[PDB]
Design an enzyme around this catalytic site. Structure first.
Site, PDB file in Angstrom:
ATOM      1  N   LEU A 169       0.668  -1.294  -0.087  1.00 19.95           N
ATOM      2  CA  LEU A 169      -0.421  -0.119   0.043  1.00 19.95           C
ATOM      3  C   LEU A 169       0.855   1.335  -0.010  1.00 19.95           C
ATOM      4  CD1 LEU A 169      -2.445  -1.059   2.684  1.00 19.95           C
ATOM      5  CD2 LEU A 169      -2.963  -0.757   0.394  1.00 19.95           C
ATOM      6  N   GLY A 170       2.021   1.260   0.321  1.00 15.40           N
ATOM      7  CA  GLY A 170       2.844   2.191   0.507  1.00 15.40           C
ATOM      8  C   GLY A 170       4.248   2.213   0.702  1.00 15.40           C
ATOM      9  N   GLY A 172       8.617   3.842   1.945  1.00 14.96           N
ATOM     10  CA  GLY A 172       9.202   4.894   2.771  1.00 14.96           C
ATOM     11  C   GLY A 172      10.648   4.645   3.029  1.00 14.96           C
ATOM     12  N   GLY A 173      11.267   5.453   3.555  1.00 15.09           N
ATOM     13  CA  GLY A 173      12.669   5.352   3.819  1.00 15.09           C
ATOM     14  C   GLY A 173      13.244   4.160   4.615  1.00 15.09           C
ATOM     15  N   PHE A 174      12.099   3.903   5.722  1.00 19.06           N
ATOM     16  CA  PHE A 174      12.221   2.928   6.834  1.00 19.06           C
ATOM     17  C   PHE A 174      11.635   1.650   6.511  1.00 19.06           C
ATOM     18  CE2 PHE A 174      15.177   4.918   9.813  1.00 19.06           C
ATOM     19  CZ  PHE A 174      15.076   6.037   9.327  1.00 19.06           C
ATOM     20  N   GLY A 175      10.577   1.756   5.507  1.00 20.15           N
ATOM     21  CA  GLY A 175      10.073   0.329   5.140  1.00 20.15           C
ATOM     22  C   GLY A 175       9.043   0.401   4.244  1.00 20.15           C
ATOM     23  N   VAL A 177       4.473  -0.652   4.063  1.00 21.26           N
ATOM     24  CA  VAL A 177       3.112  -0.670   4.476  1.00 21.26           C
ATOM     25  C   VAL A 177       2.312  -1.896   3.483  1.00 21.26           C
ATOM     26  CG1 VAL A 177       0.790   0.107   5.402  1.00 21.26           C
ATOM     27  CG2 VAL A 177       3.035   1.451   5.655  1.00 21.26           C
ATOM     28  N   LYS A 192       2.628  -1.817   8.979  1.00 17.88           N
ATOM     29  CA  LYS A 192       3.919  -1.111   8.617  1.00 17.88           C
ATOM     30  C   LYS A 192       5.113  -1.765   9.282  1.00 17.88           C
ATOM     31  CE  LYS A 192       5.907   3.467   9.040  1.00 17.88           C
ATOM     32  NZ  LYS A 192       5.729   5.032   9.709  1.00 17.88           N
ATOM     33  N   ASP A 288       5.926  16.721  10.183  1.00 18.86           N
ATOM     34  CA  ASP A 288       5.976  16.247   8.882  1.00 18.86           C
ATOM     35  C   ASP A 288       4.769  16.428   8.109  1.00 18.86           C
ATOM     36  OD1 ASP A 288       7.942  15.366   7.124  1.00 18.86           O
ATOM     37  OD2 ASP A 288       7.310  13.086   7.826  1.00 18.86           O
ATOM     38  N   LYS A 290       2.795  17.004   5.246  1.00 24.19           N
ATOM     39  CA  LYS A 290       2.837  17.056   3.531  1.00 24.19           C
ATOM     40  C   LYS A 290       2.043  15.983   2.956  1.00 24.19           C
ATOM     41  CE  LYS A 290       6.298  13.449   4.036  1.00 24.19           C
ATOM     42  NZ  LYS A 290       7.824  12.928   3.707  1.00 24.19           N
ATOM     43  N   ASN A 293       1.701  12.347   3.432  1.00 26.48           N
ATOM     44  CA  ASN A 293       1.333  12.018   4.734  1.00 26.48           C
ATOM     45  C   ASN A 293       0.038  11.722   5.066  1.00 26.48           C
ATOM     46  OD1 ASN A 293       3.852  10.871   5.274  1.00 26.48           O
ATOM     47  ND2 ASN A 293       4.206  12.605   6.768  1.00 26.48           N
TER      48      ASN A 293
HETATM   49  C1  LIG Z   1       1.838   7.694   4.838  1.00 28.73           C
HETATM   50  C2  LIG Z   1       3.149   7.089   4.254  1.00 28.73           C
HETATM   51  C3  LIG Z   1       3.569   5.910   3.949  1.00 28.73           C
HETATM   52  C4  LIG Z   1       2.246   5.143   4.189  1.00 28.73           C
HETATM   53  O1  LIG Z   1       1.695   4.467   3.023  1.00 28.73           O
HETATM   54  N1  LIG Z   1       1.885   4.738   5.516  1.00 28.73           N
HETATM   55  C5  LIG Z   1       0.642   4.272   5.402  1.00 28.73           C
HETATM   56  C6  LIG Z   1       0.205   4.221   6.844  1.00 28.73           C
HETATM   57  C7  LIG Z   1      -0.819   3.707   7.370  1.00 28.73           C
HETATM   58  C8  LIG Z   1      -1.870   2.979   6.380  1.00 28.73           C
HETATM   59  N2  LIG Z   1      -2.963   2.433   6.322  1.00 28.73           N
HETATM   60  N3  LIG Z   1      -3.356   2.376   5.081  1.00 28.73           N
HETATM   61  C9  LIG Z   1      -2.575   2.539   4.400  1.00 28.73           C
HETATM   62  C10 LIG Z   1      -1.387   3.048   4.879  1.00 28.73           C
HETATM   63  C11 LIG Z   1      -0.211   3.361   4.439  1.00 28.73           C
HETATM   64  C12 LIG Z   1       4.823   5.780   3.424  1.00 28.73           C
HETATM   65  C13 LIG Z   1       5.773   4.892   4.343  1.00 28.73           C
HETATM   66  C14 LIG Z   1       5.676   3.750   4.216  1.00 28.73           C
HETATM   67  C15 LIG Z   1       6.481   2.804   5.138  1.00 28.73           C
HETATM   68  C16 LIG Z   1       7.366   3.413   5.959  1.00 28.73           C
HETATM   69  F1  LIG Z   1       8.001   2.956   6.771  1.00 28.73           F
HETATM   70  C17 LIG Z   1       7.500   5.039   5.698  1.00 28.73           C
HETATM   71  C18 LIG Z   1       8.433   5.725   6.493  1.00 28.73           C
HETATM   72  O2  LIG Z   1       9.664   5.122   6.521  1.00 28.73           O
HETATM   73  N4  LIG Z   1       8.057   6.638   7.582  1.00 28.73           N
HETATM   74  C19 LIG Z   1       8.977   7.333   8.168  1.00 28.73           C
HETATM   75  C20 LIG Z   1       9.316   6.551   9.581  1.00 28.73           C
HETATM   76  C21 LIG Z   1      10.689   6.752  10.169  1.00 28.73           C
HETATM   77  C22 LIG Z   1      11.019   6.237  11.393  1.00 28.73           C
HETATM   78  C23 LIG Z   1       9.928   5.418  11.927  1.00 28.73           C
HETATM   79  C24 LIG Z   1       8.799   5.293  11.235  1.00 28.73           C
HETATM   80  N5  LIG Z   1       8.306   5.901  10.163  1.00 28.73           N
HETATM   81  C25 LIG Z   1       6.624   5.476   4.829  1.00 28.73           C
HETATM   82  N6  LIG Z   1       5.489   6.819   2.800  1.00 28.73           N
HETATM   83  C26 LIG Z   1       5.063   8.189   3.332  1.00 28.73           C
HETATM   84  O3  LIG Z   1       5.802   8.957   2.944  1.00 28.73           O
HETATM   85  N7  LIG Z   1       3.872   8.268   4.223  1.00 28.73           N
END
Ligand SMILES: CC1=C(C(=O)Nc2ccc3[nH]ncc3c2)[C@H](c2ccc(F)c(C(=O)NCc3ccccn3)c2)NC(=O)N1
Length: 499
Positions: A169-170, A172-175, A177, A192, A288, A290, A293
């Protein structure tokens, strides 16, 4: 309905004596055990329905539930119905433990003009009654006994085999979802998954724990909720509200005319404002904000969905920390000043501008511009407004994008309420929005697809979150099907202690 075949075995009640340990070590608090915890509420209610007289006090409480959701035009008719069902001298279901004195005060506030929290005092005194003898009697009962069994289940280890994992579903830098599903109940969530390796290499521990603990304690309809936290061999997982409707970045830029109709932008802004308010109420600065998010759910409502950079600020303190995303960092952050809640109002300004204009205020959409120069524009230039902004959109954006933190909208005594009073939102009914009773102006198409370690790991992986877990059991009808008692006024085997 997506349940595994053995779910009744997976969720088999323990024998009641295995809950001996829980019984001794559980705070025996009425509000928590009979109202806040949803399974505890239903059980306390069941117990009441077996005692002549108490089902009146609960019927009344449901009647008021219905009232607090009733519109203003029909608030009078409903207030009068409740009066002559439950509170008058002659009423058929007279409740004696609400003072006649309070009946009096409430009639007078009624005949003036009905005030949504009209039965504030009457509900209070009702609870004041229920928490004495009835609650203590509930504690003697089979029904609390059963609560403890539910609690036992709530605390069982949670591992990767509790879930099944599906589509990404999404990212990011750290993993990443993924959509996931609880095996035993079929409920959908988002998982996540954070690779242990990446966390350590990037020293992301704080961020990960902060996020987990903040999602754990926040409970807002505008922020994703946490249901579970657990570890695997290689990862740390958070199981969160599933948001299937895409993120705002996608929705903003998914058109000729990047940028929304004001109507729609207004609406998202309001929900995000409320989300921010809920976080601020707990002294969390988000930092954060944006578009990526913010996500939509299936109905088009939004939630703040990542809190990796959020942090709790102790009362009466400021923090230092130059974190965030380029183009969305407030001047006091870019300048590495000490700050409190203020950056979030800056970010809200950035979001409203971009939702209307289709571009960050300091950055063309797909403009090749370096970090250093964006940062420079944030500090040294004023943003420009096109024909696309109404005066009130322009006004609020400028007020939120005041460079000086101390003088910026939202950062005064009223906090968020000052922002809600801006003419930009002059048409928005916030009480209804906050109660989830306003339909959004856009529904998404479901047709789219868009050493010291070990210590940290145990603090992270706490298992099920009590209240979300109980809602899950109810919502999926695991409660209703499994919560059965012995036949014809007897105890079921799981409750007999001679066993
Ligand atoms: C909102 C979001 C992501 C995302 O899709 N999150 C998400 C959260 C809850 C959710 N429910 N259903 C879909 C869904 C999707 C996606 C994302 C996915 C996995 C990630 F690990 C991260 C991510 O690295 N976030 C920063 C972070 C740093 C340290 C500790 C925790 N988090 C970001 N990218 C982003 O910029 N923002």
């Amino acid at each position: 309905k997506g349940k595994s075949k053995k779910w009744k075995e997976i969720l088999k009640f323990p024998h009641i004596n295995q809950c001996e340990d829980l019984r001794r070590t559980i705070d025996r608090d009425y509000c928590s055990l009979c109202d806040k915890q949803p399974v505890g509420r239903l059980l306390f209610r069941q117990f009441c329905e077996t005692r002549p007289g108490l089902e009146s006090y609960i019927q009344f409480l449901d009647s008021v539930a219905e009232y607090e959701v009733t519109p203003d035009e029909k608030l009078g008719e409903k207030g009068k119905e409740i009066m002559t069902k439950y509170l008058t001298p002659k009423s058929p279901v007279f409740i004696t433990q609400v003072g006649r004195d309070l009946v009096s005060q409430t009639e007078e506030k009624l005949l003036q003009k009905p005030c949504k929290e009209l039965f504030s005092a009457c509900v209070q005194s009702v609870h004041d009654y229920l928490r004495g003898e009835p609650f203590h009697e509930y504690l003697d009962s089979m029904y609390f006994d059963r609560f403890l069994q539910w609690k036992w289940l709530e605390r069982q280890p949670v591992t990767k085999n509790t879930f099944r994992q599906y589509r990404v579903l999404g990212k990011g830098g750290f993993g990443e979802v993924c959509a996931c599903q609880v095996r035993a109940t079929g409920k959908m969530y988002a998982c996540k998954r954070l690779e242990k390796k990446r966390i350590k290499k990037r020293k992301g521990e704080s961020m990960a724990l902060n996020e987990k603990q903040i999602l754990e304690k926040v409970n807002s309809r505008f922020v994703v909720n946490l249901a579970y936290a657990y570890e695997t061999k290689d990862a740390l997982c958070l199981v969160l509200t599933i948001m299937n409707g895409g993120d705002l970045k996608f929705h903003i830029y998914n058109m000729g005319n990047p940028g929304f109709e004001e109507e729609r932008a207004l609406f998202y802004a309001a929900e995000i404002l409320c989300g921010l308010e809920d976080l601020h109420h707990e002294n969390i600065v988000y930092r954060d904000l944006k578009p990526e998010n913010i996500l939509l759910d299936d109905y088009g409502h939004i939630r703040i969905s990542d809190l990796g950079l959020a942090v709790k600020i102790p009362e009466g303190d400021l923090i230092r920390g130059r974190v965030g995303t380029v183009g969305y960092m407030a001047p006091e952050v870019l300048n590495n000043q000490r700050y409190g809640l203020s950056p979030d109002y800056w970010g809200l300004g950035c979001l409203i501008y971009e939702m209307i204009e289709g571009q960050s205020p300091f950055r063309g959409r797909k403009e090749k511009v370096k970090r250093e120069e964006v940062d420079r524009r944030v500090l040294e230039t004023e943003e420009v407004y096109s024909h696309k902004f109404s005066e009130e959109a322009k006004s609020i954006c400028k007020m939120l994008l005041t460079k000086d933190a101390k003088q910026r909208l939202g950062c005064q005594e009223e906090g968020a309420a000052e922002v809600k009073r801006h003419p930009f939102f002059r048409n928005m009914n916030f009480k209804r929005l906050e109660a989830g009773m306003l339909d959004p102006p856009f529904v998404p198409d479901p047709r789219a697809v868009y050493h010291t370690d070990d210590d940290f790991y145990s603090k992270f992986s706490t298992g099920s979150v009590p209240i979300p877990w109980q809602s899950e059991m109810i919502e999926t009808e695991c409660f209703k099907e499994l919560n059965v008692f012995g036949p014809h006024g007897t105890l079921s085997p799981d409750l007999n202690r001679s066993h």
